[PDB]
């Protein structure tokens, strides 16, 4: 269930905010409010406090919309999308 | 309290690669989907933790990388790409100086200690790090890269420790599996009092 | 003789990454299937060369790797993993040595 997955990601964000008030500074909240209507859910990875924002778009069109919105309204010169892909390898090791 | 077999877990590292070979270990980061914080002591000790998470590469690359190669000199060289630094460890005392001022190498030092290059974790007793490395066949050169800074929330520090542990595992023929690598990582972070 | 635009080929390098970003380049090696040596001057200059070759990774890894990152100090630091060495280049004279 993709919709339930996104909603539960949002709930994890809510739980983390309830555990730590400093995880969601007002700038992160403004970034969120910019695109919250196009997501099933979102959260910061780990302890949070800023850094990276994980978003579950409702559909590919919503993801394109989110990219466009955050690109045309960057909160600072350093913000940028990072392409993430699930790793089917985990830790790898090899020899020359 | 968290120390379990953190004192008596002995290893016998042996040079398991050829003289001109380099070991490359690499790992992605992670995003925790749910249950974060429940793995944190002492609550995890009270009731156990549940965490759903997954491994992810960023921009098509594993952000944690480690290179291990034999060294002509019988010491340990540590290089950091992300911190742009280098350090020479020649003695057991230097290897276990985890809180050395200004050193960004506490993680690989603890990892090499757990692999059996510190006396408390070595099955064989050695007079010095130099003598252990002479019996080993060479010194060790470890280059580290954390392409994502610690405190980013993507698991950089723990995963980097695990990557160093896995590279050293392959380099020293310790025959650890991934689960044992993660457990040794837990032990490592307890050594560093994270 | 081989110098062509090797003197007047001008570039304008600009820092194109963010301050905390690291660039990772990597390449496999190659095996030449046929025509090796025909690309070697001056014979290649006499008649041109033909070479069939392909790129190959060894043990599932690209054997050639390079990391480039910004530096707080305004010099160039060079590190070699395979040679285990480091060098600081501060001047044009040192860079071209």
Coordinates of N, CA and C in Angstrom, one line a residue, chain C residues 11-87:
Chain C
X11 N 41.3 27.6 -21.2 CA 40.1 27.2 -20.5 C 39.8 28.3 -19.4
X12 N 38.6 28.3 -18.9 CA 38.2 29.2 -17.8 C 37.5 28.3 -16.7
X13 N 38.3 27.7 -15.8 CA 37.8 26.8 -14.8 C 37.0 27.7 -13.7
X14 N 35.8 27.2 -13.4 CA 35.0 27.9 -12.4 C 34.5 26.8 -11.4
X15 N 34.5 27.1 -10.1 CA 34.0 26.2 -9.1 C 32.5 25.9 -9.4
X16 N 32.2 24.7 -9.9 CA 30.9 24.3 -10.3 C 30.2 23.4 -9.3
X17 N 30.7 23.2 -8.2 CA 30.1 22.3 -7.2 C 29.9 23.2 -5.9
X18 N 29.0 22.7 -5.0 CA 28.8 23.3 -3.8 C 30.0 23.1 -2.8
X19 N 30.0 23.9 -1.7 CA 31.2 23.9 -0.9 C 31.5 22.6 -0.2
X20 N 30.5 21.8 0.1 CA 30.6 20.5 0.8 C 30.5 19.3 -0.1
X21 N 30.7 19.5 -1.4 CA 30.5 18.5 -2.4 C 31.9 17.9 -2.8
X22 N 31.9 16.6 -3.1 CA 33.0 15.9 -3.6 C 32.7 15.3 -4.9
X23 N 33.6 15.4 -5.9 CA 33.4 14.9 -7.2 C 34.2 13.5 -7.3
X24 N 33.5 12.5 -7.7 CA 34.1 11.1 -7.8 C 34.0 10.7 -9.3
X25 N 35.2 10.6 -9.9 CA 35.3 10.1 -11.3 C 36.0 8.7 -11.2
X26 N 35.6 7.8 -12.1 CA 36.1 6.5 -12.1 C 36.0 5.9 -13.5
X27 N 37.0 5.1 -13.9 CA 37.1 4.5 -15.2 C 37.6 3.1 -15.1
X28 N 37.1 2.2 -16.0 CA 37.7 0.9 -16.2 C 39.0 0.9 -17.0
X29 N 39.6 -0.3 -17.1 CA 40.8 -0.4 -17.9 C 40.3 -0.9 -19.3
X30 N 41.2 -1.3 -20.1 CA 40.9 -1.7 -21.5 C 41.7 -2.9 -21.9
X31 N 41.2 -3.7 -22.8 CA 42.0 -4.7 -23.5 C 41.9 -4.4 -25.0
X32 N 43.1 -4.3 -25.6 CA 43.1 -4.1 -27.1 C 43.0 -5.4 -27.8
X33 N 42.0 -5.6 -28.6 CA 41.8 -6.8 -29.4 C 42.7 -6.9 -30.6
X34 N 42.9 -5.8 -31.3 CA 43.7 -5.8 -32.5 C 44.1 -4.4 -32.9
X35 N 45.2 -4.4 -33.6 CA 45.7 -3.1 -34.2 C 46.6 -2.3 -33.2
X36 N 46.9 -2.8 -32.0 CA 47.8 -2.1 -31.2 C 49.2 -1.9 -31.9
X37 N 49.8 -0.8 -31.5 CA 51.1 -0.2 -32.0 C 50.8 0.6 -33.2
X38 N 49.7 0.4 -34.0 CA 49.5 1.2 -35.2 C 49.0 2.6 -34.8
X39 N 48.7 2.9 -33.5 CA 48.4 4.2 -33.0 C 49.6 5.0 -32.5
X40 N 50.8 4.4 -32.6 CA 52.0 5.0 -32.0 C 52.7 5.9 -33.0
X41 N 53.0 7.1 -32.6 CA 53.8 8.0 -33.5 C 55.2 7.4 -33.7
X42 N 55.8 7.7 -34.9 CA 55.3 8.4 -36.0 C 54.5 7.6 -37.1
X43 N 54.4 6.3 -36.9 CA 53.7 5.5 -37.9 C 52.2 5.9 -38.0
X44 N 51.5 6.2 -36.9 CA 50.2 6.7 -37.0 C 50.2 8.0 -37.8
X45 N 51.2 8.8 -37.7 CA 51.3 10.0 -38.5 C 51.5 9.6 -40.0
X46 N 52.3 8.5 -40.3 CA 52.5 8.2 -41.7 C 51.2 7.7 -42.3
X47 N 50.4 6.8 -41.7 CA 49.3 6.2 -42.4 C 48.0 6.1 -41.6
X48 N 48.0 6.6 -40.4 CA 46.8 6.4 -39.5 C 46.8 5.0 -38.9
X49 N 46.1 4.9 -37.7 CA 46.0 3.7 -37.0 C 44.6 3.2 -36.9
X50 N 44.5 1.8 -36.8 CA 43.3 1.1 -36.6 C 43.5 0.3 -35.3
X51 N 42.6 0.5 -34.3 CA 42.6 -0.3 -33.1 C 41.2 -0.7 -32.7
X52 N 41.0 -2.0 -32.5 CA 39.8 -2.5 -31.8 C 40.1 -2.9 -30.4
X53 N 39.4 -2.3 -29.5 CA 39.6 -2.5 -28.0 C 38.3 -2.3 -27.3
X54 N 38.2 -2.7 -26.0 CA 37.0 -2.5 -25.2 C 37.4 -2.2 -23.8
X55 N 36.4 -1.5 -23.1 CA 36.6 -1.2 -21.7 C 36.1 -2.4 -20.8
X56 N 36.9 -2.7 -19.8 CA 36.5 -3.8 -18.9 C 36.8 -3.4 -17.4
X57 N 35.8 -3.7 -16.6 CA 36.1 -3.6 -15.1 C 36.7 -5.0 -14.7
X58 N 37.5 -4.9 -13.7 CA 38.3 -6.0 -13.1 C 37.7 -6.3 -11.7
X59 N 37.3 -7.5 -11.5 CA 36.7 -7.9 -10.2 C 35.6 -7.0 -9.8
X60 N 34.8 -6.6 -10.8 CA 33.6 -5.8 -10.6 C 33.9 -4.3 -10.1
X61 N 35.0 -3.8 -10.4 CA 35.3 -2.4 -10.0 C 36.0 -1.6 -11.1
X62 N 35.9 -0.3 -11.1 CA 36.7 0.5 -12.0 C 38.1 0.7 -11.4
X63 N 39.1 0.3 -12.0 CA 40.5 0.4 -11.4 C 41.0 1.8 -11.3
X64 N 40.5 2.7 -12.1 CA 41.0 4.1 -12.0 C 40.0 5.0 -11.3
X65 N 40.4 5.7 -10.3 CA 39.5 6.5 -9.5 C 40.1 7.8 -9.1
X66 N 39.3 8.9 -9.1 CA 39.8 10.2 -8.7 C 38.7 10.9 -7.9
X67 N 39.1 11.5 -6.8 CA 38.2 12.4 -6.0 C 38.8 13.8 -6.0
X68 N 37.9 14.8 -6.2 CA 38.2 16.2 -6.3 C 37.3 16.9 -5.3
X69 N 37.8 17.7 -4.4 CA 37.0 18.5 -3.5 C 37.6 19.9 -3.3
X70 N 36.8 20.8 -2.9 CA 37.3 22.2 -2.6 C 38.1 22.1 -1.3
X71 N 39.1 23.1 -1.2 CA 40.0 23.1 -0.1 C 39.9 24.5 0.5
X72 N 40.0 24.5 1.9 CA 39.9 25.7 2.6 C 41.1 26.6 2.3
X73 N 42.3 26.0 2.1 CA 43.5 26.8 1.8 C 43.6 26.9 0.3
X74 N 44.1 28.1 -0.2 CA 44.2 28.4 -1.6 C 45.4 27.8 -2.2
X75 N 45.5 26.5 -2.2 CA 46.6 25.7 -2.8 C 46.0 24.4 -3.4
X76 N 46.8 23.6 -3.9 CA 46.4 22.3 -4.4 C 47.1 21.2 -3.6
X77 N 46.3 20.3 -3.1 CA 46.7 19.1 -2.4 C 46.5 17.9 -3.3
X78 N 47.6 17.1 -3.5 CA 47.5 15.9 -4.3 C 47.8 14.7 -3.4
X79 N 47.0 13.7 -3.4 CA 47.2 12.5 -2.6 C 47.1 11.3 -3.6
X80 N 47.9 10.3 -3.3 CA 48.0 9.0 -4.1 C 47.8 7.9 -3.2
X81 N 46.7 7.1 -3.4 CA 46.4 5.9 -2.6 C 47.3 4.8 -3.0
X82 N 47.5 4.5 -4.3 CA 48.3 3.4 -4.7 C 49.8 3.6 -4.4
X83 N 50.3 4.9 -4.5 CA 51.6 5.2 -4.1 C 51.8 5.6 -2.7
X84 N 50.6 5.8 -2.0 CA 50.7 6.3 -0.6 C 51.5 7.5 -0.4
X85 N 51.1 8.6 -1.1 CA 52.0 9.8 -1.0 C 51.1 11.1 -1.0
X86 N 51.6 12.2 -0.7 CA 50.9 13.5 -0.7 C 51.9 14.6 -1.0
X87 N 51.4 15.6 -1.7 CA 52.2 16.7 -2.2 C 51.4 18.0 -2.2

